[PDB]
Structures are given as C-alpha cells and as structure tokens.
Design a binder for this molecule. Structure first.
Ligand SMILES: *[B]([O])([O])[C]([C]C1=[C][C]=[C][C]=[C]1)[N]C(=O)[C]([C]C1=[C][C]=[C][C]=[C]1)[N]C(=O)C1=[C]N=[C][C]=N1
Ligand SMILES: Nc1ncnc2c1ncn2[C@@H]1O[C@H](COP(=O)(O)OP(=O)(O)O)[C@@H](O)[C@H]1O
Lengths: 537, 159
C-alpha cells in the first residue's frame, strides 16, 4: 500500500493549485516500480520532496529594530555606519509587509575581504528574525553545472542545490544566503547568470524554473543576503538591482576587541583546555602587530590556536597547577620568531627628513622620506624604487622651492650647485602615488636650509606648483596607522576636513590635526627656527 | 516620459515616418536602426519601455551581449528527450505580440565566440527579405519573423 501512501501525503500537504496538478498526473504514473524503471524509479525523488517540502509553514517576522540591534551588536563590533545601512535595508520591507513589498525592493549584498565578518552575519541576521540561516557555498560553481536541477533524463534527478535550500529548511519563509557570487564565469553555453536573475528577481522570486522540478516554485518570503569580495566578476544583469553595502575591514583596536572575547575562547575550548590557560590583553597586541598582517581576521585566530595547541602539548610535557598565564614576555616561545616588525616613529628632530603616511590594501604604513644636500652640479636623483608619478611630485615640490629661495632662507643657487637625493626606505617595495609631496616638500626644504624637521609630526598632502596643497586619498587607514605608531600631531589638507569623521572618536581626540591649504603653512610649522648644520656653499 | 529632450524625441519622429508613410514597400526595406549617445548621467533606455507603451505594444528583452551560444537564440534539435528552443521564439512566447520591441541589451560588450555569433543571428531577421525565412533546430520549418523593432542604444560603437 506504499504506492497508495503517496496519495495520503500528497493530498494532505499544502497545497497550492500551482503544485496541485503537478502530482495528479504522476500520482498514478509511477506505480510501475516492479520492472525497470525508466519512469517509476525516477519518481521517488519526485514526491519525497513534495511529500516533505513545507507549505505555508510561517514564522513571526520580527518587526522590532531593537530585537535586531540588541542582538546584532551581541555578535559583532564596530561597523557603526555599516550597521546603519544594515537596518536601512531591513525596515523597508516592514513598511509595506505582506503586499506591495515582495513585488519590488532592492537586494542586500555584502562585499569585503574574506577575513572580515561576511558569513557569521548571515547566521546573525537570520537568527535575529526567526528563520533558518543557510550558507550555500557557491565557491565551486563557475559554469552551467548546477544552478538549476537536471531534467528527468536520468534516475539521479536530485533537485538543484539552490532549491535544496528550500528542502533543507522546514519552513516556507527562510533566510537563504549565498557565498562569493564573483566566483563565476559567464563565457560559455548556459550563462550561469541567467537563472540567478529569476532566483533573485524582486518580481518573480515566487517562480523558480527548473528542469526536474518543472513547476516554478512559489516562495513568498525568501530573505536574501548576498556575499562577495569583488564587484567586477559579479554578473551585470544582477548587480544593477542590488543596494550593495560594503564591508570595510578592521582596525588595530577592534582587532584587539574581537580576539579578546570571541576568537580566543572559541579556540581555547576546542583546544582541549576548557579554561586552563589564558593570554593577557597586552600580549595579544604583539600577536595583533608582530604576526597579524591581514585585512580581515581570518589570519589572526590561526595564531592563537597555534598558541593553544603548542600550549596544550606543554601539559603532557609537564603539568602545571590551575591555569597558566601568557603575557607579551613569552609569546615567541609559542608562535616562533616574529615575522613583521612594527612601524614605530623616531621624536628627535632630524635634518632633511619627514614622516610620510602610506595607504596599503592591508592597512597603513609610516614611511620616512629622507633627503641629502651634497655639493654637486644640480642633478636630482630619486632613489628607492619610486613610482613614476611620485618622481613628478618631487620636482613639483622642488620647483616650488626654487621660486621661493628667499622666503624660507634657502641657498640662492641651490638649483645649480647642490645635487639633491631623495630616498624612501625600504628599497625593495614599489612606492607610488603624488600625495607624499607635502612631506617631500618639507625634507627638501629642511635639508637645504639646514634646519631640522621635527619627527613627532605626521604629514601627508599632494602639492601643486604655485603652492596650494591638494586633497589626498585614504585618510582613514593612514591616520589609524599614524596613531598606533604613537604620533600625536598630523598635517592634512583643508579639503580632507570632511572625511575626518570616519575615524573613531577616541583617535580624533588624540590627534591635533593641523589643517593646512598652502605649503607656506607647513614649512613654518615643521622647521626648527635655528641652523644646526653648516650649509653646502 | 522625461523632462526636456525637445532636441531628442523628434529624431525618432523623423524615423517612424519611413514606415507609416510607405507601407508594404519601404516599410521593411533595410531601414537604418537607431542609436543614441549622451553623458553617463542620464537614463537613456528609460525611454525604451515608453516606446511600445507609447504605441500600445508590449516589450521583451534578451541580453545580446550575453547572446554568445546556441542554448541562446539558436535552436535545440528535436532528437533529444528534452531541450528548450532558442530565446527568440521564447521571447515571442513570453509576449503575446508578434512584434516585441527589444533593446540591444548589453550588446555593447558583445563577444563573438563559438556557438553562433549573435551578429549572424540578427542578419536573418534584420534583412528585409530574410526575416520571413528563419530556421531553427527546435523546428526545421521556415518561420516567419514578422517584426522585432530593435531599439539600438549604447555608448560603444566599435566592437
Ligand atoms: B600617496 O600617493 O597616497 C602616498 C605617497 C607616499 C606616502 C608614503 C611613502 C611614499 C609615498 N602613496 C600611497 O599611499 C601609495 C598608495 C597609493 C598610490 C597611488 C595613489 C593613491 C595611493 N602606497 C605606497 O606607496 C606604499 C605603501 N606602503 C608600502 C609601500 N608603498
Ligand atoms: N564582528 C565580528 N565579531 C566577531 N567575530 C568576527 C567578526 N567579524 C568576523 N569575525 C570572525 O571572522 C571569521 C570569518 O570566517 P568565515 O565566515 O568562514 O570567512 P568569511 O569572512 O570569508 O565569511 C568568523 O570565524 C568570525 O568568528
């Protein structure tokens, strides 16, 4: 009577008319499963979903931003303006919920380096709305292999892994998540972006065309959270209807915060030791700096585990009572020898030198431009694997000085008898871009005038010929690098006064950001008023 | 539809005249299909949907830039136990109007790799004496492509 039990469950689940006739034809067709079977064994994976797929299994959608906020921060730190845009996508649905919402609304998409929080939010955003998070690992699909299930052309007509999200969950109003959509390639037959349109259509996400599940499934509420790292490979006909929210990356303060309570324990327990060893907050800072050189945090936790594991072996090597503590005075005994020096400022004013700030995709760096003035013919040597653009900024600063030899008390004929030389340690890393011109403008001015330039001041500003300081890019990462180096005075163009707000409130208080517009402001600020070394001529 | 463009719309009012004023002849005789240009601030094909809507017709769209294979507009032979025809007839299917206007969707990045160049496919329907003489793999029968008023518009005119 099992061939009749298929009636019992198919007639009782659901059922919408859109999927009613889809069984009334095959409710009888598959009963020939004694011989073969071309069309009787290929229908057990037909009802076993239909007899098991949920219908109308609803859930109380959270209409309380405090239900979300008070638990989102319960899982993640910082990302304030980021979390500001997150809620900004949330309550747009609950303003027209039920009807006049599912018909048209943008799609949330998260982009950021793969170390920073990208998937945990999915479990965080879903649990905060009484649904079921699901991490469809799309990394591995770049072709027309499985974006919609096969036909009934074989016995292995297992549904599409996409619609299996509707199978794995037991409700009809889930939170379905994707991973790294830019891991595709739409350059051959069966464009893998075509189906995703219908899957993500803010108009027909209630019709899921397939090849074995011939009926386009009707899914009323399917909350979506899309993740990626590169906007480029993301399909074009999909990107154009996504209110994408970027995920920036961490700072050396929050990097100490997360690992203080999240990464360290969630790696200590799994390290056998369930509270029999603990690392001090000061010690983490070393591991924060001297071994962590990643934008995200995926690289960080691996070190702490390596501490725990190699720490665990010490127990079997020799026991110790209670919990053993680990401070910044014993870390190398666990992780080995450091791999990245810190970048600490120098304090004592030096001749013809300045503190340059450089942006890098993994943070910020404090570079030290240094120049020399030797009796020569007037050449200009720009050394240190400098980029072609920066070399232009060097003369740009130098030429400005040449027309103002009296105004800063420079040598009258330094264009002619003083052969400069600009170096930027280290010598192996390609340094590029016009922003550092304000600094160069300083050291060159100092080196000629023999008045030292104080180093407790950071500076960065692109220079123009007649002398106006122009805006730069990446003020956020640079300043953050400057503070963690221990600098408390910064010089910055007037234009970038706007983007000063992105810094945390604390660092902004720590720095006395001098805001300038012309170089004449800087050279009075930075140069010692007295001559300490003899000139060239 | 939009605001301004008094120097824009008429350049199609000076285009549709060749069809109404002369029907049967000079209405499908290899007419010059449109093209538009402007800064990258204005919504340009936003006028597109308001062309059929302006003439009461309907509208469909297939990404010709994404048209680079035979699972696209080209046909699927009837030998198989399952296969879908080209999106040309499918486009005709989703619509209920034999002349569905189609913007040249993203053809601005048109490649011409294997499985039929999307240009040769247009040659059949675009040619005024060939559109009535289509040919599928889904079928074999010369299928009369009456009209698909392509609205060509992009900011690339080289590849
Ligand atoms: B400026 O262009 O933003 C700056 C100039 C500079 C600063 C410090 C030392 C040397 C030069 N350069 C950079 O920030 C560049 C990145 C860049 C390049 C072009 C346009 C914008 C930004 N980064 C570096 O040169 C760099 C950073 N870290 C290590 C090595 N090089
Ligand atoms: N704001 C945050 N608070 C706590 N942990 C975080 C935060 N952001 C990221 N993480 C950690 O980063 C890790 C990311 O891992 P995973 O999700 O596998 O990679 P991806 O970042 O590519 O999604 C998680 O283990 C998570 O614990």
């Amino acid at each position: 009577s099992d061939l009749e039990a298929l009636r019992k469950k198919i007639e009782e689940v659901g059922m919408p008319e859109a999927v009613k006739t889809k069984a009334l034809k095959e409710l009888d067709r598959l009963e020939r499963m004694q011989q073969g079977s071309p069309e009787a064994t290929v229908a057990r994976t037909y009802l076993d979903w239909l007899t098991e797929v949920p219908w109308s299994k609803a859930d109380p959608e959270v209409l309380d931003i405090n239900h979300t906020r008070q638990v989102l921060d319960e899982d993640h730190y910082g990302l304030k303006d980021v979390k500001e845009r997150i809620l900004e996508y949330l309550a747009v649905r609950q303003l027209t919920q039920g009807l006049d919402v599912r018909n048209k609304a943008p799609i949330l998409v998260l982009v950021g380096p793969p170390g920073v929080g990208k998937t945990s939010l999915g479990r965080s955003i879903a649990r905060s709305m009484n649904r079921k998070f699901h991490r469809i690992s799309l990394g591995g699909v770049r072709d027309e292999a499985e974006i919609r299930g096969h036909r009934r052309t074989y016995i292995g007509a297992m549904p599409g892994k996409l619609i299996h999200a509707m199978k794995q969950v037991g409700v009809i109003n889930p939170v379905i998540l994707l991973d790294e959509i830019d891991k595709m390639s739409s350059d051959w037959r069966g464009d893998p972006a075509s189906a995703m349109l219908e899957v993500l259509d803010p108009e027909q996400n209630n019709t899921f065309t397939d090849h074995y599940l011939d009926v386009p499934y009707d899914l009323s509420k399917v909350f979506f959270i899309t993740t990626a790292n590169t906007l480029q490979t993301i399909p074009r006909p999909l990107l154009d209807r996504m209110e994408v929210i970027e995920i920036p990356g961490y700072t050396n303060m929050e990097k100490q915060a997360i690992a203080r309570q999240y990464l360290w324990p969630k790696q200590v327990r799994e390290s056998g030791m369930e509270g029999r060893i603990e690392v001090t907050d000061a010690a983490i800072l070393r591991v924060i700096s001297e071994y962590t050189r990643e934008a995200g945090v995926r690289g960080l936790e691996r070190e702490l585990g390596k501490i725990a594991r190699k720490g665990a072996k010490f127990w079997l090597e020799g026991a110790w009572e209670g919990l053993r503590t680990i401070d910044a005075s014993d870390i190398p005994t666990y992780l080995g020898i450091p791999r990245y020096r810190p970048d600490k400022a120098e304090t004592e004013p030096q001749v013809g030198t300045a503190q340059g700030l450089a942006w890098t995709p993994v943070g910020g760096t404090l570079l030290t431009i240094e120049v020399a003035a030797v009796p020569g013919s007037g050449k200009l040597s720009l050394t240190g694997q400098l980029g072609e653009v920066m070399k232009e900024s060097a003369q740009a600063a130098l030429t400005y000085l040449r027309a103002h030899t009296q105004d800063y008390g420079l040598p009258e004929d330094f264009y002619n008898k003083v052969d400069l030389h600009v170096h930027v340690p280290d010598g192996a890393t390609p340094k590029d871009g016009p922003s550092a011109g304000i600094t160069m403008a300083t050291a060159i001015a100092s080196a000629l005038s023999r008045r030292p330039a104080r180093m407790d001041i950071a500076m960065t500003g692109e220079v123009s010929l007649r002398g106006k300081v122009m805006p730069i890019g990446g003020v956020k990462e640079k300043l953050l690098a400057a503070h963690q180096a221990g600098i408390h005075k910064i010089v910055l163009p007037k234009d970038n006064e706007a983007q000063l707000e992105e810094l945390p409130k604390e660092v902004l208080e720590g720095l006395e950001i001098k805001l300038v517009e012309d170089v004449g402001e800087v050279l009075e600020y930075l140069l010692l008023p007295e001559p300490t070394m003899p000139p060239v001529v």
